[PDB]
Design a protein around this ligand. Structure first.
Ligand SMILES: N[C@@H](CCC(=O)N[C@@H](CS[As](SC[C@H](NC(=O)CC[C@H](N)C(=O)O)C(=O)NCC(=O)O)c1ccccc1)C(=O)NCC(=O)O)C(=O)O
Ligand SMILES: N[C@@H](CCC(=O)N[C@@H](CS[As](SC[C@H](NC(=O)CC[C@H](N)C(=O)O)C(=O)NCC(=O)O)c1ccccc1)C(=O)NCC(=O)O)C(=O)O
Ligand SMILES: O=[As]c1ccccc1
Ligand SMILES: O=[As]c1ccccc1
Lengths: 209, 210
């Protein structure tokens, strides 16, 4: 620390890492960049891949949302108990990211024409996470092992945004449904999820969800 | 029997980098090849976590997701930076490689004919960040992060090799990336692997485009 998040005024790709920071009792600074400021161009040019989020951890400057999650996971002990679990955490996170990618493509490039097919395909896209839960302590703890990992925060966000896109999408999945409820009730996270800081930001940048 | 098994289609694709890594690190592995006809039968696919390959076995640990495999071999073989800060930098590089890889995969499989001109025009802007990273690490003379090779080097190396095939001369604009490709490619175990039929006789992609 100290931590700084630099991003647009949306949940988007910072939603998970914010949940992580809040639930872990960490303090951070939000540096909000408006689309108008972004269009000026100087900040963009300074960014490694010309994109946000940008993250500061003292003198360390990071880009890439999953890089930031993994860094926080590594430094805060949210990356499994050992190498085997770390691999499983990665495997979950990479699966979350694949579905997030599809979600983002839909939202920004093909929402109207593409939504019906996306929603019909969604159960098949969620099932692997239900299966993973079913294979770990009967779904009663976390997505990997006995302690929370960065992948839990990312999967939780993925599930929350999909409940908005396709209400009822988890009804067929009892372990996932219970998992969302349980994690969302963790006291610090619950307070964050209730706060205007979360509630009053849109999920995406284009008014679609 | 080797403790590593790679289960994939008969293509370089998303296994090229992890194979280079294993070869360059002198690790033994087994290749289990899945034909497109075998895949269509559906049972293997149904058994894969996300319905896709590669699948990788390290003893009884079964992994899916190409970057998960890279990170796993990175941790277990000591190719993930010297400390926590370097490990984050290695991740930042690999995540950048995979963004460009994704763009490349979309071009190859969904829009090659119509998209290629635009893609190659945009390519220097997409490679520049890696040249910038090289320029800020020991003048580009060693690796992408730090002074030891990482899994991100093998992934970046593969990304660069396949782009030279797509857009020959694309690294002429980037002297550090150019020298880097030559340098890593000359590492003895890797050089042997890259020249071997095991590598050369597989196509880069599954649809004949490159
Ligand atoms: N015409 C598009 C604009 C281009 C675009 O960036 N499209 C996005 C979806 S826009 As979103 S998140 C903001 C974005 N950052 C990233 O994509 C980082 C990805 C990285 N792999 C990571 O995980 O960190 C960004 O900074 N864009 C600026 C730029 O490139 O100039 C949003 C939109 C508006 C307001 C707030 C947030 C895309 O397809 N990304 C791919 C991905 O997420 O992997 C448009 O209309 O928006
Ligand atoms: N909707 C279809 C998907 C079809 C598809 O796979 N499209 C590809 C390009 S085809 As290539 S790589 C072989 C593959 N695995 C992956 O894509 C895993 C991606 C991942 N995040 C990772 O890093 O591991 C696959 O299993 N395809 C078959 C399938 O999905 O049933 C190839 C090589 C040799 C022979 C044929 C094809 C795509 O666009 N992938 C995206 C990406 O690579 O990130 C469906 O699933 O039914
Ligand atoms: As991931 C992702 C990349 C490009 C466009 C949409 C989503
Ligand atoms: As990455 C990626 C995902 C879907 C389609 C093309 C490329």
């Amino acid at each position: 620390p100290p931590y700084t998040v630099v991003y647009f005024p949306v949940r988007g790709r910072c939603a998970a890492l914010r949940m992580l920071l809040a639930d872990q009792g960490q303090s951070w600074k939000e540096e909000v960049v408006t689309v108008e400021t972004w269009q000026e161009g100087s900040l963009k040019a300074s960014c490694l891949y010309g994109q946000l989020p940008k993250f500061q951890d003292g003198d360390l400057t990071l880009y890439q949302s999953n890089t930031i999650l993994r860094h926080l996971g590594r430094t805060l002990g949210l990356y499994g108990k050992d190498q085997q679990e770390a691999a499983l955490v990665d495997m979950v996170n990479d699966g979350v990211e694949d579905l997030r990618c599809k979600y983002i493509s839909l939202i920004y490039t093909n929402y109207e024409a593409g939504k019906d097919d996306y929603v019909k395909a969604l159960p098949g896209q969620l099932k692997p996470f239900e299966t993973l839960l079913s294979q770990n302590q009967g779904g009663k703890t976390f997505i990997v092992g006995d302690q929370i990992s960065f992948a839990d925060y990312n999967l939780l966000d993925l599930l929350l945004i999909h409940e908005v896109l396709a209400p009822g999408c988890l009804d067929a999945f009892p372990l996932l449904s219970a998992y969302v409820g349980r994690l969302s009730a963790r006291p610090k996270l619950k307070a964050f999820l209730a706060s205007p800081e979360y509630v009053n930001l849109p999920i995406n940048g284009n008014g679609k969800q």
